[PDB]
C-alpha cells in the first residue's frame, strides 16, 4: 500500500474526521450528482430533488455505515483486500454494482473531505487519500475476477 511515513499522514488526519457527517453527505452528494446510482437505492424512499436526498433519513444512516467501512479499512490498510472480503461479495455478486462506482463515491468522499477541512487538506494529503480510495476501490472490486 503506502510508505509507512505516508500511512502516518492518512492516519494522523483521519483523527480529525467527523466520519458520521462526511458519511451522510457523501452518499447524498453522490446520489444527487450521479443520478443512475440512485437505482440501487430506491428502497430508500423519495430521492426526486436535491433536498429529498440530502434530507431522507435512510441515506443518512446508510452513510455513517459506509464511512465505517472506511474508518474501518483505514485500520487495516496493509491488507484492504482481506478486510473487505465480505462487502466485496455483497456488492458484486448480489447487488451487481459496476466497480466504476466504487471510484465515483471514492472521489466524492474526497470532495466532501476537502469541503470539511479547507486548504488544510493540501494536495500532498490528498495525493495520499486518493490511493486510499483507489485501494478501497480495489478491495470491493475483486470478486469481479
Amino acid at each position: 500500500m503506502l510508505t509507512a511515513e505516508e500511512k502516518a499522514a492518512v492516519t494522523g488526519f483521519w483523527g480529525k474526521v467527523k466520519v458520521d457527517e462526511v458519511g451522510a453527505e457523501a452518499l447524498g452528494r453522490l446520489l444527487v450528482v450521479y443520478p443512475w446510482t440512485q437505482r440501487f437505492f430506491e428502497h430508500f424512499g423519495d430521492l426526486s430533488s436535491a433536498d429529498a436526498v440530502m434530507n431522507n433519513a435512510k441515506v443518512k444512516a446508510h452513510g455513517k455505515k459506509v464511512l465505517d467501512s472506511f474508518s474501518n479499512g483505514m485500520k487495516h490498510l496493509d491488507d484492504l483486500k482481506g478486510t473487505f472480503a465480505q462487502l466485496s461479495e455483497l456488492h458484486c455478486d448480489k447487488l451487481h454494482v459496476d466497480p466504476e462506482n466504487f471510484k465515483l463515491l471514492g472521489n466524492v468522499l474526497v470532495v466532501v473531505l476537502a469541503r470539511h477541512h479547507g486548504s488544510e487538506f493540501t494536495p500532498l494529503l490528498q495525493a495520499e487519500f486518493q490511493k486510499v480510495v483507489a485501494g478501497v476501490a480495489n478491495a470491493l472490486a475483486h470478486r469481479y475476477h
Partner: protein
C-alpha cells in the same frame, strides 16, 4: 444540455471564483499532477515543483478559458472549439485525463468556497465540466 438552474449556479459559484480564477487554476492543476501522476507526461517541458512560474501560466490560461466558457454556456460547442482542435490532434490527450482535471477543479472550489459549494451546486459544476470536457474531445470522433 444544461438546465437553467445549473447555468445560474455556475455563474454564481464562479462569480465567487472572482478575480481568483487562475489561482484555483494552478491549484486544480497541481492537485492533479500529484494524485494522478501519470498525467505529468503530457506536461514535460514544465518545472512542476510547487508554485512554478509556468504552471501558474497554465493555471491562468486554463481558468481563463473556463471563465470564457462560463460566459456563453449555450454555445460551448463553439467558444471552446479551437481548444478541441489542439487537445486532440496536436497533443492527443487520452480522455480519462479530462475527468481528472474536472475532479481536480471540483475539489479546489470546495477547498476555498465551502458555503457556496452546496450539493445542487456540486451537481452543477460537474454537469458543467462533463459538458466542457466533451466539447474538448469532440474531434476524437
Amino acid at each position: 444540455v444544461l438546465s437553467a438552474a445549473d447555468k445560474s449556479n455556475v455563474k454564481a459559484a464562479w462569480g465567487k471564483v472572482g478575480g481568483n480564477a487562475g489561482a484555483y487554476g494552478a491549484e486544480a492543476l497541481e492537485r492533479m499532477f500529484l494524485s494522478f501522476p501519470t498525467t505529468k507526461t503530457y506536461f514535460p517541458h514544465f518545472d512542476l515543483s510547487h508554485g512554478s512560474a509556468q504552471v501558474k501560466g497554465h493555471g491562468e490560461k486554463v481558468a481563463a478559458a473556463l471563465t470564457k466558457a462560463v460566459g456563453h454556456l449555450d454555445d460551448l460547442p463553439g467558444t471552446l472549439s479551437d481548444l478541441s482542435d489542439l487537445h486532440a490532434h496536436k497533443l492527443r490527450v487520452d480522455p480519462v485525463n479530462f475527468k481528472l482535471l474536472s475532479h481536480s477543479l471540483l475539489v479546489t472550489l470546495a477547498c476555498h468556497l465551502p458555503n457556496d459549494f452546496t450539493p445542487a451546486v456540486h451537481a452543477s459544476l460537474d454537469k458543467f465540466l462533463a459538458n466542457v470536457s466533451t466539447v474538448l474531445t469532440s474531434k476524437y470522433r
